[PDB]
Amino acid sequence: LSVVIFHFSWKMQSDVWGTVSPDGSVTHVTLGNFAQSAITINGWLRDFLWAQAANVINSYGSALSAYGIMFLAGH
């Protein structure tokens, strides 16, 4: 289930989610990383588990501050 929800989160925030623009173009959250960088274990580590964990890392002194001390708590 960890790999299933990882595939869900990365595919939906690379190919589905993101903001929209009035001319019809769609820019995603991770700018389409799942195409050529989801096929590597280093791609799953660098572009998903290192790049997207920065929002848990750098969120101190803010509203998302309990998630950092739940991140380290789960470890």
């Binding site: 274990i41 280093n42 791609g43 580590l45 660098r46 890392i57 101190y60 501050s65």
Partner: protein, 729 residues
């Protein structure tokens, strides 16, 4: 069945476990059918010579590869910017990016940048061209062949050493203090003053040159008469360039104290004078123990005379305990080797004695971490052989009421106090780290508990650091120990007060908490190991553990169920702790020196006091250049360390399978695979000779321990090398 030859009980079972158990009991010579007492020692002696030849072949291979494929002649021209080369790359799987990225340090072939300290070593020794160290490689091949021939001839019955020769402790302790530790350090001080220091003065001294020129122009006669100050007449000044003759006054034994200002290393004359002053004391202390000549000491009368009221019977009947057994000697040897190996590690980063090795930061990091990971191994093995000594070679009727038996009589006090010390350090070091991490998470980092480590700063104050203002005994200039007129006052004081080197680093409030963490890991690893050694004989669960042996799986599910009851399984848990605390101190060392080398000391001084600072500014920040060793766009020279990073993660998680899952599941699975092979039609032709079973309990424990260990070591040797070679290279 011929394999194994030594064991008869493993040469008869038809299972596949006899291959594994024949592999792992090949060196335990005590459990060999048909081996007497003296054949044990003679096989040990021949195997000693085999290992001492393997280590010479390994040193000869390092020498031969620096000679052949290394840019050693191009490294001495500019050793501050160019990179050393270990060897070349010849795997046929390289594409075009992996060839265009691995042609580093100016070489058309794909090479591999050396991160061990062999180049700075061979430059400080005085080797300049590749031809002389290639000749050293050929010399070490001949020397390894010499020790191989010694190992062969000491198995013939004519040259077979008797048991009383191996029991002759006093007639080899003298030669190991004088003829091995003294005269070899004497020969090394001789090589220093003859070849190493004149090559640091520019004079090329070879084997056809040292017989003619003297190292000092005064000759040998000022040593024979006296007034040795002419050997320290004119030292090398601060304006000296290494390898040339520029401000280099010829004097072979100059005690200065402090660092060479050009190479950030110790003075080579100081190194030579130190080795002479240790060779003299070692040859003096080698004439202590009694031999054929009646003058000397016999260790029985020394040990039997050290009694006491509180001590008990003292060390009486204890020479026979050490001299008859072998695991006691191996435990003492591994303990002393482990403490001096960590001494090597702590004195090769703060007192570097190699040319331009304080600037090559990745080399210093790799050498320190390698020697600490050797020292943790040797400490665990010292205690493991202590437990083997308590299982096999301990008799309570001869060691009656002495310090060993009185050690065993209060083992429930020892390991309970170690349990107390471990819980005392652990509850509050984790308590302060979680307290700091919560109050930084709540945006209030002023509520952190930052205890000033005043004891260590006091040690720096009596060492020479006048930074903290504690005017005690060396920083106060009017002290008793300062105004002695000794040679090491002004150079060591200016070296310890220079905030550029890595000698006596500025200890901040984070180092208090991390040094308590290393005291925690040391006390808990000592807890598991001493509990394994003292309960190796027995306890309230099974007091016949001397009868079962050292390593055995369990004693069934009865009496509560004694999984991990052997002393081998206390080694098993202590191996994880040794890897854990070595990871703690090497994370701490590498982050401190990354703050020192980059000049950003404030990052380590602000962020290390809470756990997310370690998780962000060390594990997340420094590993950014590692995982980008291969992108979908391109491949740089850090790709092999990114592949080694993922490799180390895979082996570290493969050990989890053997650790968590146990044997009975895998035996039920192997029954089905055996059925499928015996009922597949075209595979009924091929049948096994040995019946395939699952791995045994203690066996697959050891396999999961091996994967945990080498997985840990490979992923950390990937990260520790590539992060500081991406930052400084």
């Amino acid at each position: 069945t011929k394999f194994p030859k030594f064991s008869q009980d493993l040469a008869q079972d038809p299972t596949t476990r006899r291959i594994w158990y024949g592999i792992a009991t090949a060196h335990d010579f005590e459990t060999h059918d048909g081996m007497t007492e003296e054949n044990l020692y003679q096989k040990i002696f021949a195997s000693h010579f085999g290992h001492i030849a393997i280590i010479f072949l390994w040193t000869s291979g390092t020498l031969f590869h620096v000679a052949w494929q290394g840019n050693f002649e191009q490294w001495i021209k500019d050793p501050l910017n160019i990179r050393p080369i270990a060897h070349a790359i010849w795997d046929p799987h390289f594409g075009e990016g992996a060839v265009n990225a691995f042609t580093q340090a100016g070489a058309s072939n794909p090479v591999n940048i050396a991160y061990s300290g062999v180049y700075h070593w061979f430059y400080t020794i005085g080797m300049t061209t590749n031809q002389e160290l290639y000749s050293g490689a050929v010399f070490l091949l001949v020397l390894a062949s010499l020790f191989l021939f010694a190992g062969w001839l000491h198995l013939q019955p004519k040259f077979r050493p008797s048991l009383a020769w191996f029991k002759n402790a006093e007639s080899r302790l003298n030669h190991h203090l004088a003829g091995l530790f003294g005269v070899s350090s004497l020969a090394w001080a001789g090589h220093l003053v003859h070849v190493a220091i004149p090559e640091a003065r520019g004079q090329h001294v070879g084997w056809d040159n040292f017989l003619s020129t003297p190292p000092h122009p005064a000759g040998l006669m000022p040593f024979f008469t006296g007034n040795w100050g002419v050997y320290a007449a004119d030292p090398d000044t601060a304006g000296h360039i290494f390898g040339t003759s520029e401000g280099a006054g010829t004097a072979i034994l100059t005690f200065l104290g402090g660092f060479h200002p050009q190479t950030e290393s110790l003075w080579l004359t100081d190194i030579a004078h130190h080795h002479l002053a240790i060779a003299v004391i070692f040859i003096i202390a080698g004439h202590m123990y009694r031999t054929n000549w009646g003058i000397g000491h016999s260790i029985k009368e020394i040990l039997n005379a050290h009694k006491g009221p509180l001590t008990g019977a003292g060390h009486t009947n204890l020479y026979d305990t050490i001299n008859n057994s072998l695991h006691f000697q191996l435990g003492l040897a591994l303990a002393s080797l482990g403490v001096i190996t960590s001494l090597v590690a702590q004195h090769m980063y703060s007192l570097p004695s190699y040319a331009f090795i304080a600037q090559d930061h990745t080399t210093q990091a790799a050498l320190y971490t390698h020697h600490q990971y050797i020292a943790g191994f040797l400490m665990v093995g010292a205690f493991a052989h202590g437990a083997i000594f308590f299982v096999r070679d301990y008799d309570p009727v001869a060691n009656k009421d002495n310090v060993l038996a009185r050690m065993l009589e209060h083992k429930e006090a020892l390991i309970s106090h170690l349990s107390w010390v471990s819980l005392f350090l652990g509850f509050h070091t984790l308590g302060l780290y979680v307290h700091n991490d919560v109050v930084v998470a709540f945006g209030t980092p002023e509520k952190q508990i930052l205890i000033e480590p005043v004891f260590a700063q006091w040690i720096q104050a009596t060492s020479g650091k006048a930074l903290y203002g504690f005017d005690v005994l060396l920083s106060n200039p009017d002290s008793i120990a300062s105004t002695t007129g000794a040679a090491w006052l002004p150079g060591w004081l200016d070296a310890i007060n220079s905030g550029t080197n890595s000698l006596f680093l500025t200890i901040g409030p984070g180092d208090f908490l991390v040094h308590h963490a290393i005291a925690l890991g040391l006390h808990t690893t000592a807890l598991i190991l001493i509990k394994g050694a003292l309960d190796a004989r027995g306890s309230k669960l099974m007091p016949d553990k001397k009868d079962f042996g050292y390593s055995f799986p369990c004693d069934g599910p009865g009496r509560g169920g004694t999984c991990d009851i052997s002393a081998w399984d206390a080694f098993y848990l202590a191996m994880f702790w040794m890897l854990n605390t070595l990871g703690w101190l090497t994370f701490y060392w590498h982050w401190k020196h990354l703050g020192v080398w980059s000049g950003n000391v404030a990052q380590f001084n602000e962020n290390s006091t809470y756990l997310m600072g370690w998780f962000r500014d060390y594990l997340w920040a420094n590993s950014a250049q590692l995982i980008n060793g291969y992108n979908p766009y391109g491949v740089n020279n850090l790709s092999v360390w990114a592949w080694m990073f993922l490799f180390g993660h895979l082996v570290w998680a493969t050990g989890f399978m053997f650790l968590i899952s146990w044997r009975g599941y895998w035996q039920e699975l192997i029954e089905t695979i055996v059925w499928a092979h015996e009922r597949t039609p075209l595979a009924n032709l091929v049948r096994w000779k040995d019946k395939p079973v699952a791995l045994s309990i203690v066996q697959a424990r050891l396999v999961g321990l091996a994967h945990f260990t080498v997985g840990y070591v490979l992923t950390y040797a990937a990260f520790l090398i590539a992060s500081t070679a991406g930052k400084f290279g």
